[PDB]
Design a protein around this ligand. Structure first.
Ligand code: ZN
Ligand code: ZN
Ligand code: ZN
Ligand code: ZN
Lengths: 277, 277
């Protein structure tokens, strides 16, 4: 089955959300707001550039889908937890960090050499966006060598806090997995809690890394007696991690197969050379 | 017919060069040198991170090539003149800006879905490196929406000043195309001069953009009577540009077909929102 149109319309959903955020944020914040938050004119300028780039990413997907005889998805209805400039930068970082696995997963389904070149070229742009927002928020712009994929439903899981409703059947999220803390080095013990009362029998932690793939462990129990399941960041991983609860070892490569996913994933910002110290 | 090994060994040549540069740069410069140049500890830390990431990109290509039964290319012999931090940053930006079209071109030849996912994941990392070095040198980290490909020999042309010799038959560069100026906005008139004498019969300027593909124009002549050919940055382009001389108009998509290339390409840093003000 040629899944090209499916993949493109999924990416269009991703870019409708991102473009809506940046259009609204540029509308509501000025360079003076950025400067009051300690940023420079060129940071606001690049922020407008990100808006323009994401509008292009959305419009290009619309054009390509139409050229293939498809019907482009409309926007959904969104909500963004924006108050001050700092929150704008955090939301931006969150969106761009989820962009990359979305594009990487979708590229597995794009049949054409030429269309892969175009889509990869947009992934490259969103990776530059991610590096910019990392740097502005004190995170390493390039924390590791390899970014990895996630599935469409995994991406829906990352996006769900920003979606109020969709007017068409979009990819369904898994329940949200809350991580505490959501950043830190190898060896960090992460308390994990699920938004729904899922079956925890046989649950394992999947730590999804770009450089090592999926690494499995059986969860621990929180030392504070709260009953939360813990997952410990294992050695050898590099870059941004995604942590999920999965059914046993049913799946070796969770980034390309969500058939065992129970809760999550959510992102974890692994410490890296380049973080503010 | 399956060009996967050819593409991977070409990328290995690219990453032998980049990793060699960053290894020697870290040996020669310290965090105190970076701080004396106005940078912060986190910028030196990220620089070491880039070295580590590029070493990983190289080593991963070696492993994959062996796993496919191929013989990995050894390093070439390089020349990287060592002066100051400003030069380190400029060379770094130059390498990362060239390694993105290298990966995008090579990805056209990689047959396996799973190998494409891995290689795209490294391209994403190099795009983050490029964004970091752009920002530290006062250029927009994300100057446009789409990065485009170049051919193997185009990449060899960009790399040629760093290569002393190779101990195996490597892709032969085209002559260098010098561009004056090498940055500016739409409408900039660029004086173009080739390193070798070329028959000018039917030569066109090829402006190679990621968002609009290759745009062709007949060269102009410098107004100062200097007799140098000129190419004018056309409307609508976004992001980093590559400018080459090509012969005739039978090849339209120069980023994927170098069979009409005569001189260049060389890079041109198009002005963008995010450049230092
Ligand atoms: Zn995008
Ligand atoms: Zn994005
Ligand atoms: Zn690399
Ligand atoms: Zn690189």
């Amino acid at each position: 089955m040629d899944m090209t149109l499916d993949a493109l319309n999924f990416l269009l959903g991703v870019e409708h959300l991102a473009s809506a955020f940046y259009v609204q944020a540029v509308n509501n914040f000025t360079a003076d707001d950025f400067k009051a938050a300690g940023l420079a004119q060129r940071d606001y300028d690049q922020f407008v550039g990100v808006r323009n780039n994401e509008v292009d990413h959305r419009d290009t997907l619309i054009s390509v889908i139409k050229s293939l005889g498809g019907k482009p998805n409309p926007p959904c209805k969104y909500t963004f937890p924006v108050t001050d400039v700092a929150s704008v930068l955090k939301v931006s970082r969150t969106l761009e960090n989820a962009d990359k696995p979305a594009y990487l997963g979708a590229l597995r389904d794009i049949k054409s050499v030429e269309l892969r070149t175009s889509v990869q070229g947009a992934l490259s742009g969103d990776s530059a966006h991610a590096a910019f927002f990392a740097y502005l928020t004190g995170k390493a712009p390039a924390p590791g060598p390899v970014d990895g994929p996630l599935t469409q439903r995994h991406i829906a899981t990352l996006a769900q806090d920003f979606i109020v409703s969709c007017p068409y059947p979009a990819p369904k999220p898994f329940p949200k997995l809350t991580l505490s803390p959501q950043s830190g080095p190898v060896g960090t013990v992460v308390a994990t809690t699920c938004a729904q009362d899922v079956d925890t029998n046989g649950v394992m932690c999947a730590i999804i890394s770009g450089n090592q793939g999926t690494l499995m462990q059986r969860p621990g129990q929180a030392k504070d007696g709260s009953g939360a399941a813990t997952c410990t960041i294992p050695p050898g991983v590099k870059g941004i991690l995604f942590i999920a609860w999965v059914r046993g070892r049913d799946v070796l490569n969770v980034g390309v197969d969500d058939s065992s996913t129970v809760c999550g994933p959510n992102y974890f910002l692994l410490s890296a050379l380049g973080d503010a110290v």
